[PDB]
Amino acid sequence: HAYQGVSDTEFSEWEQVAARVAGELSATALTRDRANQNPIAEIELLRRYGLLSFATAREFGGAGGSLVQALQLGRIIAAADGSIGQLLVYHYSNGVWTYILGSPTQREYISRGVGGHGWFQGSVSNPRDPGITVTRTEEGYRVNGKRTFATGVAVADLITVLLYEAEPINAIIPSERDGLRFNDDWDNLGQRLTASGSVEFDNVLLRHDEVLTGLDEYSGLDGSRERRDGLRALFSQLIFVHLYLGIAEGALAAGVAYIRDKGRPWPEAHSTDVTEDPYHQQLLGRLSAGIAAGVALADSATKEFEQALAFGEAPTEAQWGALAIRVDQAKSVATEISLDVTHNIYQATGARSTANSVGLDIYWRNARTHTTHDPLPYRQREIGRHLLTDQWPSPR
Amino acid sequence: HAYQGVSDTEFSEWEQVAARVAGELSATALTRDRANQNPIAEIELLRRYGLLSFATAREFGGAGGSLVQALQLGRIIAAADGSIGQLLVYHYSNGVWTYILGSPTQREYISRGVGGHGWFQGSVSNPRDPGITVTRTEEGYRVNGKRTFATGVAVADLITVLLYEAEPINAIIPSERDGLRFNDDWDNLGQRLTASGSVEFDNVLLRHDEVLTGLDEYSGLDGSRERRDGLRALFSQLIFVHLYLGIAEGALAAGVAYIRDKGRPWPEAHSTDVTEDPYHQQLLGRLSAGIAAGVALADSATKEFEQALAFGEAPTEAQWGALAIRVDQAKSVATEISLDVTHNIYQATGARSTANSVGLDIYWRNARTHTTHDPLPYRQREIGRHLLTDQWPSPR
Amino acid sequence: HAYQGVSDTEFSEWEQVAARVAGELSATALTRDRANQNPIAEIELLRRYGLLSFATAREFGGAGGSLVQALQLGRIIAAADGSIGQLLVYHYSNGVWTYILGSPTQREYISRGVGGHGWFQGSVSNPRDPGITVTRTEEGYRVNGKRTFATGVAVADLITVLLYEAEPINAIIPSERDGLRFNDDWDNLGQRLTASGSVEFDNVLLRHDEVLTGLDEYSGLDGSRERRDGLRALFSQLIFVHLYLGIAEGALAAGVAYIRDKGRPWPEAHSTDVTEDPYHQQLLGRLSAGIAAGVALADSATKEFEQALAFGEAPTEAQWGALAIRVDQAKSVATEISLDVTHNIYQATGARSTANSVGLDIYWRNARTHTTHDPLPYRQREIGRHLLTDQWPSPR
Amino acid sequence: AYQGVSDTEFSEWEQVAARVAGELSATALTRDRANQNPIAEIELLRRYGLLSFATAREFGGAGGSLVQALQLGRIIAAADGSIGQLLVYHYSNGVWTYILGSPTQREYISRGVGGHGWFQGSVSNPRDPGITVTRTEEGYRVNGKRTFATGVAVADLITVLLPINAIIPSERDGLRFNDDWDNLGQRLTASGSVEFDNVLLRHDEVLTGLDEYSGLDGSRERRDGLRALFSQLIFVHLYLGIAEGALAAGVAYIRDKGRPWPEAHSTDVTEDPYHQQLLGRLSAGIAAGVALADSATKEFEQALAFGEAPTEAQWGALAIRVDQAKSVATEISLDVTHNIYQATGARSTANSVGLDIYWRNARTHTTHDPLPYRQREIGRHLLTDQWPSPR
Numbered sequence A, B, C: 001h002a003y004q005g006v007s008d009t010e011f012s013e014w015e016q017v018a019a020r021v022a023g024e025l026s027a028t029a030l031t032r033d034r035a036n037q038n039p040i041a042e043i044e045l046l047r048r049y050g051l052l053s054f055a056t057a058r059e060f061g062g063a064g065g066s067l068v069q070a071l072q073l074g075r076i077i078a079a080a081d082g083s084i085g086q087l088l089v090y091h092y093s094n095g096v097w098t099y100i101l102g103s104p105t106q107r108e109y110i111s112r113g114v115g116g117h118g119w120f121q122g123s124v125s126n127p128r129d130p131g132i133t134v135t136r137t138e139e140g141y142r143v144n145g146k147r148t149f150a151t152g153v154a155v156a157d158l159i160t161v162l163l164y165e166a167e168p169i170n171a172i173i174p175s176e177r178d179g180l181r182f183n184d185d186w187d188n189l190g191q192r193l194t195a196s197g198s199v200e201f202d203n204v205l206l207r208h209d210e211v212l213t214g215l216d217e218y219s220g221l222d223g224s225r226e227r228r229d230g231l232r233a234l235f236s237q238l239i240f241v242h243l244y245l246g247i248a249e250g251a252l253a254a255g256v257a258y259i260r261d262k263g264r265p266w267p268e269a270h271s272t273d274v275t276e277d278p279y280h281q282q283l284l285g286r287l288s289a290g291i292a293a294g295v296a297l298a299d300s301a302t303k304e305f306e307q308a309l310a311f312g313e314a315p316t317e318a319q320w321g322a323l324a325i326r327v328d329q330a331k332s333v334a335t336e337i338s339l340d341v342t343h344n345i346y347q348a349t350g351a352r353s354t355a356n357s358v359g360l361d362i363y364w365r366n367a368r369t370h371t372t373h374d375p376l377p378y379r380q381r382e383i384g385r386h387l388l389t390d391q392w393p394s395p396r
Numbered sequence D: 001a002y003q004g005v006s007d008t009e010f011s012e013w014e015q016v017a018a019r020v021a022g023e024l025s026a027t028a029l030t031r032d033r034a035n036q037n038p039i040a041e042i043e044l045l046r047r048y049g050l051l052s053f054a055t056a057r058e059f060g061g062a063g064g065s066l067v068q069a070l071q072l073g074r075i076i077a078a079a080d081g082s083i084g085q086l087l088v089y090h091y092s093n094g095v096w097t098y099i100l101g102s103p104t105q106r107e108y109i110s111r112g113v114g115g116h117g118w119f120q121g122s123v124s125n126p127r128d129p130g131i132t133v134t135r136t137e138e139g140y141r142v143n144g145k146r147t148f149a150t151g152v153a154v155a156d157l158i159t160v161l162l163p164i165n166a167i168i169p170s171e172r173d174g175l176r177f178n179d180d181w182d183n184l185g186q187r188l189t190a191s192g193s194v195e196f197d198n199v200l201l202r203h204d205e206v207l208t209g210l211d212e213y214s215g216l217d218g219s220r221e222r223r224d225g226l227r228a229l230f231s232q233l234i235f236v237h238l239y240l241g242i243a244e245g246a247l248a249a250g251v252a253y254i255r256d257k258g259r260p261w262p263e264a265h266s267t268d269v270t271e272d273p274y275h276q277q278l279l280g281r282l283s284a285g286i287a288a289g290v291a292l293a294d295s296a297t298k299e300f301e302q303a304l305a306f307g308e309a310p311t312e313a314q315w316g317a318l319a320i321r322v323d324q325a326k327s328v329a330t331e332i333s334l335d336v337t338h339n340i341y342q343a344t345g346a347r348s349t350a351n352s353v354g355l356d357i358y359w360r361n362a363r364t365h366t367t368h369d370p371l372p373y374r375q376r377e378i379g380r381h382l383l384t385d386q387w388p389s390p391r
Helices: A008-027 A029-035 A040-048 A067-080 A082-101 A104-117 A224-262 A278-309 A317-344 A361-370 A376-389 B008-035 B040-048 B067-080 B082-101 B104-116 B224-262 B278-309 B317-349 B362-370 B376-389 C008-027 C029-035 C040-048 C067-080 C082-101 C104-116 C224-262 C278-309 C317-344 C361-370 C376-389 D007-026 D028-034 D039-047 D066-079 D081-100 D103-115 D219-257 D273-304 D312-344 D357-365 D371-384
Strands: A121-124 A133-136 A140-147 A158-163 A169-174 A180-182 A199-207 B121-124 B133-136 B140-147 B158-163 B169-174 B180-182 B199-207 C121-124 C133-136 C140-147 C158-163 C169-174 C180-182 C199-207 D120-123 D132-136 D139-146 D157-161 D165-169 D175-177 D194-200
Touching: A008 A029, A008 A040, A008 A067, A029 A361, A040 A082, A067 A082, A067 A224, A067 A278, A082 A104, A082 A121, A082 A158, A082 A224, A082 A361, A104 A158, A140 A158, A169 A199, A224 A278, A224 A317, A224 A361, A224 D371, A278 A317, A278 C278, A278 D273, A278 D312, A278 D371, A317 A361, A317 A376, A317 B317, A317 D273, A361 B362, A376 D219, A376 D273, B008 B040, B008 B067, B008 B362, B040 B082, B067 B082, B067 B224, B067 B278, B082 B104, B082 B121, B082 B158, B082 B224, B082 B362, B104 B158, B140 B169, B169 B199, B224 B278, B224 B317, B224 B362, B224 C376, B278 B317, B278 C278, B278 C317, B278 C376, B278 D273, B317 B362, B317 B376, B317 C278, B376 C224, B376 C278, C008 C029, C008 C040, C008 C067, C029 C361, C040 C082, C067 C082, C067 C224, C067 C278, C082 C104, C082 C121, C082 C158, C082 C224, C082 C361, C104 C158, C140 C158, C140 C169, C169 C199, C224 C278, C224 C317, C224 C361, C278 C317, C317 C361, C317 C376, C317 D312, C361 D357, D007 D028, D007 D039, D007 D066, D028 D357, D039 D081, D066 D081, D066 D219, D066 D273, D081 D103, D081 D120, D081 D157, D081 D219, D081 D357, D103 D157, D219 D273, D219 D312, D219 D357, D273 D312, D312 D357, D312 D371
Parallel strands: A121 A158, B121 B158, C121 C158, D120 D157
Antiparallel strands: A133 A140, A140 A199, A158 A169, A180 A199, B133 B140, B140 B199, B158 B169, B180 B199, C133 C140, C140 C199, C158 C169, C180 C199, D132 D139, D139 D194, D157 D165, D175 D194
């Protein structure tokens, strides 16, 4: 199967690669965030260090890492820069999507380009966009309409277009396909460097040989195709989990670093050593403990996703539902702890730390932004609904 | 005497004036916040609507409002713009400071300027500024050194300069006084339009007639002078309470306004009406309740401060301690709810609300910044310390 | 008219009476709680000290106190014994109920009994009791069935029987009225001494002279009668607020007392004095601040209720809804802080405090029990619904 | 030692623990209110092989690991917090005597615990004044009063920690078990006080396992420190077990006795949006605590199996991991057992329902050592680089 994984010794080296990339991204995060430019240089930095091809099989020039390993590297990157961290994990997830959606020949085309040609994958997947028209011609499909939240599409080399019709249509197109217009309407609270602006489709052609047909081998009668395709949405929730935990780890380390370097003791405190303040220590310890719990659950849930992905068949209703519950559980804890850390870190760093030259708020802006992707109470509700009614979460 | 208050019907008219000002500030808050300019226009707006002279007696051209009424108008302004709200309450507090510190003739000089000539009062009061020197000459005192967090000084007409704590030297100087250099080093997370940058004193003269001597009539032997002077710091904490609550009220109203105008229902919700989501309603209702509790305690603590200020003598150790405990309580509650509201409002507003064209984060940036003025756990510790040891809070 | 209030100096004397009663109840609270007996002696203690007649006009032998003052006395009693505090405020609320529902001659009959004859008022008002049959007789009404949560009925001298039919029937009957059986089925977590067991109705007679007719002067066409009657349910929510805050004050005081008398320092702590522990002080200060906020909002809400009760007409749609919103706000904050205090106090008191001879849990058992009377999230939801839809709460 | 059984074999042990849990949960309220010594419950664990689960098969045990043993502890703790504490304290006492005992002493204990149903108790409260040990050629004479002696009144082999560490039979003269345990929760843990009236500790019974570790470089201190770290670990699993039992009890009450609120959109109580959200939040919290707890136990097993004592960094890193697990497990167990009543309702507060037994249990034990100081240790290491060390 795909996503075989690298050895423990080799992954330690890939963690050092990610740490090297994280240090450089971290030193320029505030300047780049303020500039709000498309992250071309940052994508090139990820490409040059072999991180874009990490989750591609070694046959195609990738490292052959597992999804657990890939998202763990994503946490290291997301801790330095939430925006570039989101781009990396979305790229990995887009590869998981086209692996699920692609035929074997289509899978090979994508893996060769991602593994050995530096392709960055983006997708147009927002299902709430109105005014989208799609018509079928002999040449292929003609798509018209404006799509929003198109993360990484303006910097991607291969674009996955997902259309939510009565019969859904998913296709892969190159970046230079005519009719694509990228609007400069992304000026957001956080995740500013993710290129999540809107994309205009002006009579865009999706060729017939570009339509993904991997789901055809799964039964459209017993729900196998829906549950196989539903793994895409479950993995998207998992990358969000690791993204939030990565941002939380960066905010905690940044707050710790500010206190050790610039912190002044409070005059009412017993000690003149700011590092000995009892309230700073308790608060940082509570947050650190909470992150560790979220990470432990995250890595457990990601391993369970890999097992479901490697099933010889589509997961059953109970297998899919149990995995969705675990993903829901990881999503709930990761959202709460990341919001908790990025929000309350200022209570320990103090008044002078609120200067934009310090920029401790970038973690909050990033965490607070992406946590609104889908509402937290409804993911918690799904867990409790299963406890009260025995009904499994279903691909919606 | 001072801060007698206007009638209930007249104050309803002043609340109407504040609402008119709040609407204009709210509509331009985002654009002004980005430009980061000194708030000269906003102070003239406060001036032309009579809000700067509201807390000055009618004999000087003011409205004759009370401190309870003045801080209530402050909450209305602070809800529209946290920065301008801070300036207004800091101005009111600076009048209370010079009332406590000023002689009879000095009080009338300031009241006539603030009451009938539009003077805005700023203060240089940070006690943690090192390297400050003062030399007494035949004409007065020559002051040198850099002072930080000089809120409103760059836009003030009358500046109060406070030096030391043991043998203090407090004086009022005009904005035209030679030697004042305003550094352009205020680029902050929030409270950006408060003019809280640093100020350089280059051989600044404080004339002998400008030295405040109101504290002379209080005994320096039994602590009466310290407890009378200590009312200034308690009133600072009090305006912080009202500022935080105003900001929290603005964030709640802005989130409600967004949901009603731009909100859309979550597809998993039972209702297609976004205003009927049970989690939006529950969250907003919890936040609304917490704000109301904070306001009830805040206005009660302000009334208790007015009574202590109007005492014929300085408040005793127990009177000062009980007032400080109640102000600590209001500070703790107002800190917690304002951080709660401004952080969690995004859970109800959704992903599209994170655009900077919406700017719902300005309330968080403002509250998150100012709540770090002095650390929350130590104000809570002071309350618990009194309960466990019987030791009242005492002036510094 | 009614609930006019006593003077400030005289209310201090009544607060001294309540403190004396609270001290005695507090010393026997644990023993009486475990015995689970009907609080006949405690009702007689309240009677001897004039607390049962405090809210009755002076012409009838009562003190002439207001509802604000009466519930403030209830908080003092509730802090010593949550069960006895609930009985006192239920007695007051039952007096408010019969004041709304009673005719002028019926009001005088009850006031003369409660004011000068020591009557304790209980009610049978649970609207969720099924299988309750009531048939009209020439003599009056015959009522059969089982009613639950009949707080204080087994110790009441005057019992209000509320029947929720197509035409609601409310009447007052003596405790010796034939057909009343008191089942020994009240063995609860907390509120154990409130006599909240079930009561059987064996063909009980409600004479026509006993049917309360005070609501007849209010129109049943424009909602006046519904909103006038709805003040009863709003006052029930108000007494719950004060009950919860009193329990929280008692729990905070009991924890402070244990720490000062029995507390030992933690070996890792900086100080060998347990009263100097920074985490004890911080937590106790946060809890103290939260209680003070809830109290300030509670007393503000009670005053607004008194104004509504004294309206020349029934409250309008807007007047009733605004009062319901404020009571909802007070109910939300009082529930949260009382559960917060009684649950978290053990973190400061330590391991030895968990002995049943200490009995710190009685506050939690009491607060945790009564806060389930009606679900908190639906009260918060009502506030958020008004913000989002503009719909005022209405009598249900 | 602590090798562990296979995955398929451990599934059968989970079912054995579920059978024991179901029987305990049927009399949980009646036994808790009776406040009697849990003699029959300890025999229940003994008959089903749970007392010898963490002992090698060569001694008559199951050959399970510490990760597996504490997982079964969570199953028992979910049904009865008191009995769950006794089981994990028994397991922890085996780890203590394994660390403290000589190779010949280890086999004596393994044969009795594995092949004769011995229950191990500990007298190990470090905050007891008046404790006095006196040396004699007869051995050692111990006098004073020790409190919180969990399981001692029902233990067969008793470890006394004074350093002087020894094991004595339950029949040793001088032991006076006082009947002063009337607590909020953990009522059936036999945690009363034990009077020592000139109790003899023979030289042959003194544990000498720590002698082979150097007392000069801190190796003996760090090796012995694993005892306290494992104590904090069994507290983690106990709190999560109680939280699991409370959540399941609240869910089962709503499904079987719950009534919809008249303001709710649905007449089905299981479709209340606030019940679902609250329970789902609590469920996710427990799941995160379990994942961290089982991770920390795996790291402890490796530390114990190092042979050599863990270094300052290895011991410190393990202690940080255990503090993190302790913090999360404390917060979620208090959260679950306290907030479950918001979803169960007014009628669920009757003592015939007894849903408060979970809160009383978790609220009691979480005060064993103060939570803020365990959190402070994590933050202190982040700010000062100082690892936790054997204190």
